[PDB]
Paper text:
Doublecortin ([name]) is a neuronal microtubule‐associated protein (MAP) indispensable for brain development. It contains two homologous globular doublecortin (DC) domains—[name] and CDC—connected by a 40‐residue unstructured linker (Kim et al, 2003; Cierpicki et al, 2006), followed by a disordered C‐terminal serine/proline‐rich domain. It recognizes a corner between four tubulin dimers via a DC domain, except at the seam (Fourniol et al, 2010). Although coupled, each DC repeat within [name] appears to have a distinct role in MT nucleation and stabilization: CDC is a conformationally plastic module that appears to facilitate MT nucleation and stabilize tubulin–tubulin contacts in the nascent MT lattice, while [name] appears to be favored along the mature lattice, providing MT stabilization.
To verify this assignment, we carried out an analogous high‐resolution 3D cryo‐EM study of MTs polymerized for 1 h in the presence of NN. Since NN‐stimulated MT nucleation produces 14‐PF almost as well as 13‐PF MTs, we investigated whether there were any architecture‐specific differences in [name] observed in these MTs. Nevertheless, supervised 3D classification of all picked NN‐MT segments revealed that 73% were 13‐PF while 26% were 14‐PF. The resulting 14‐PF NN‐MT reconstruction had a resolution nearly equivalent (3.9 Å) to that of the 13‐PF NN‐MT reconstruction (3.8 Å). Crucially, [name] density is equally pronounced in both the 13‐PF and 14‐PF NN‐MT 3D maps. [name] requires only minimal structural adaptation to fit to the slightly narrower inter‐PF angle of the 14‐PF lattice compared to the 13‐PF lattice. Overall, [name] appears to be relatively insensitive to the inter‐PF angle, with identical (within the resolution) polar [name]‐MT interactions formed in each MT architecture. Despite being relatively conformationally rigid, we found [name] still capable of adapting to slightly varying inter‐PF angle, as evidenced with equal decoration of 13‐ and 14‐PF MTs with [name]‐[name] tandem (NN construct).
Residue numbers in the entry:
A (entry chain b), B (entry chain B): 1 to 429
C (entry chain N): 44 to 142
The structure:
Amino acid sequence: MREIVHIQAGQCGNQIGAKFWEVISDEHGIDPTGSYHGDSDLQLERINVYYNEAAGNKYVPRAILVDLEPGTMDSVRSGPFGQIFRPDNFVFGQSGAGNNWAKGHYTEGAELVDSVLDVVRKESESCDCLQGFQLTHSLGGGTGSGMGTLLISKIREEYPDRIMNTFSVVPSPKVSDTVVEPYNATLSVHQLVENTDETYCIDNEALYDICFRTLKLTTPTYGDLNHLVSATMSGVTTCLRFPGQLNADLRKLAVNMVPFPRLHFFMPGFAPLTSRGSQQYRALTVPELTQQMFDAKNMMAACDPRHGRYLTVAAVFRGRMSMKEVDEQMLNVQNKNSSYFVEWIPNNVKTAVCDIPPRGLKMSATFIGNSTAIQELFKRISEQFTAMFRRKAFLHWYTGEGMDEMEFTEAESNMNDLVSEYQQYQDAT
Amino acid sequence: MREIVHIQAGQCGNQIGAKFWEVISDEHGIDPTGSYHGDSDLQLERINVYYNEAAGNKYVPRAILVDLEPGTMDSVRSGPFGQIFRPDNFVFGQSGAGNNWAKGHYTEGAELVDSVLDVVRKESESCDCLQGFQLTHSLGGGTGSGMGTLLISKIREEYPDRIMNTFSVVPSPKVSDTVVEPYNATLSVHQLVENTDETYCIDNEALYDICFRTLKLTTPTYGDLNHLVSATMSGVTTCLRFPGQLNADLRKLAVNMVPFPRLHFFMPGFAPLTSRGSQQYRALTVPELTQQMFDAKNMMAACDPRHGRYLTVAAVFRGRMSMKEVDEQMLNVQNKNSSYFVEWIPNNVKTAVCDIPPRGLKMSATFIGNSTAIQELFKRISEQFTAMFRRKAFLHWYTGEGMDEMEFTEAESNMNDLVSEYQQYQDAT
Amino acid sequence: QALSNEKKAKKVRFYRNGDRYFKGIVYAVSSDRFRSFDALLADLTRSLSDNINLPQGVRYIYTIDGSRKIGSMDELEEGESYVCSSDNFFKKVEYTKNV
Ligand SMILES: Nc1nc2c(ncn2[C@@H]2O[C@H](COP(=O)(O)OP(=O)(O)O)[C@@H](O)[C@H]2O)c(=O)[nH]1
Ligand SMILES: Nc1nc2c(ncn2[C@@H]2O[C@H](COP(=O)(O)OP(=O)(O)O)[C@@H](O)[C@H]2O)c(=O)[nH]1
């Protein structure tokens, strides 16, 4: 039970998942064919959450893959672990987004979403008891920002109770991979604050520091950058797929980590992260895994938490460990950083402990942090939006798709309402 | 418990420690890999004071290595016992000090000290109960005089109770290895008399006499000169790492040897020191080890104690010996040299006896002497300072780094206050 | 003569723009270390931006008030702070609080 349907969109959201389903098949011991070659029966105990048993004792991923051009879907089926998917799920148009939000939301979105929602409705009826939907896209492009936020507005109208979380990739502040990405991010957050339950904001710029400063990688390709994102996504649902001493799921995070129905943007965090040779100059204890989850140089969103305050903190531990050792450290880091946490929430750390470690390691952890420090991230998108909108530049590529300036004004006014909320609860008393 | 964090700075302070950690690994029986190959369980009993047990039963030194150019840190990691360190601790800039105190204290010191104090704060939290910090630098250079005294002024503001001792190398009086070393020494002692608890002054010129007159070495390289300094540094803390009949530590020396909060500059001393062939024409008794610790030709600071008076005397003995034999000789050398000790301090000899000798020997000792004879050392630095300052030569290399002449005047006035204090207590009654 | 013209460095503070939690590194600003005003901005580039500030680098130097753009280095005064921005728009937060 408690099955999860995984939806992918955009060029970024497909290449994350193409590495992600390789990770999940490693934990359950699945060949690229689709058979089973594991060793323990715990791998097949909760296999139904990401898999459907086909005829012949073969398992397929419960995945839906969406694009507007076949240039990326051909890359997925060509690589390894491409034969494992079902050929019906590859839904793709022919026009291409053209790195345009309005084309992803009005023109090519309306000509594709009916073919998508039939596949969504087919996968929903196959599940015994649906847990909820997870989505992998990005905010910079036109596909994952336009077609992705269109699907959330359609799913929530058909499923007003299931959980809905997105692993969106927020654009980095220093370098810019798209000229019009302040327009795409502003018109997407206006859709994410209305129809999502929680959201995992990831910056690219934080991943380049972790691969360089921490892991000491000389040539980090996207095969290594997406591998860190995939380890974080598996670590959120690792208690739902395995027995543990203290269990949580996707529902228990949305109750704990979300104190208000708007403030649901997170920042992830993973530990441990050694080097190729510096792994032996280090002991693997719980206070060693604790101190790495809270420094600013291990965050995956480009914002220092010292500028703001935490509100809620999740910490999903994997591998066998003493519960006294975990609970004392979670108390210890709260007393010494008494100015960095919010005052009117006592015991603001939620802890979940699984039993099975990741493949190759002995123990690991996963940090899920809510904070007021992400208001600087929404200042910069709102600042770069109004810097471009006051000259009305790059606007006729959106007006010609049937959109008025009133659409931009209320979308920008929604974000400044969000900035005032994180400012208000930072100085509460 | 009672862990010690070892900090190194400068070209001199790194090459001392690079021999020093070879000595400590010999006493505890540690390979250059980092494993353990000892014979007795006493080596692992107090191993935590200079080591942290990593995963895989490997031990790393609790060391922090600081420089401004990578020319010396590359030499440390290339030699033997270079693989034992942790690669995170090698903190180094790129500009280089340029043999300049103001560059080590203002320009390149401020651009490095924040990266250093994060590593200091990480090593402090790893310790169970911190004993204190020891530092190895020199006064002649620009790195160990500028960056080193900057760290002491930052550590004392964060740790106003832990002990703080430095093994600084005072420049020799006859030869001069730096043209501007009266400027570097004067601006460093002004920082050492305010924020250190005790200080072990070592002259290079005294080490050349001991290697020639006593040990009869024809070609003494720095691999042999630093080996005598490293034997003295281990002999101070040998009672903290091993059980003994009468135990002392770094705290008990600062209570005994320091009668006034300024007069805390020492002179070391080691015994026995044989030759390569003359070792057999000598008996190893406690009165034989006694008479070698008090003559002027075994001091490691270029000052004859006969010009002044002792105030306090420590004597850390190693190896098994009769306590009656030790206490009678410490009484005997006080009665016959009744003019060479101070009058208003009775029983001015502190004795500590360990149990385990150094490697290869049967018994040894360590002399730690406080005296009024080091006022001649501070006359010469103050005389050579005012000889250069009255013409204002070599001054624009310091003024251009943002420094006024008022900084030099109060620093020189501080040293003449120190000269009057040793002059006053020499003729007390 | 030999006792020269006291080639001294000004001890001035540089707050960076936007970052409220920053103290301002005091530089040794003199005419000997920078022959022109343009050479000072190259030193401001590396020693202010580390991870999260200033995508455009350093372009404009303001007063702490700030109501005047700094021109040449002769317009600097000893012992007063300056906001180092990179755009025309000035952010008005309390920089000098809790030095
Ligand atoms: N982390 C990560 N980001 C990616 C990857 N591929 C693309 N991106 C990001 O995705 C964004 C571009 O959006 P894109 O996926 O092409 O959307 P589309 O062009 O509308 O289909 C930029 O911010 C890229 O940095 C990837 O493999 N990993
Ligand atoms: N005893 C001893 N002194 C050394 C050694 N290496 C350098 N020195 C002394 O260190 C001083 C020069 O300072 P240095 O360490 O180079 O500082 P820096 O140049 O600012 O990095 C001189 O007094 C040298 O005699 C060494 O291996 N042993």
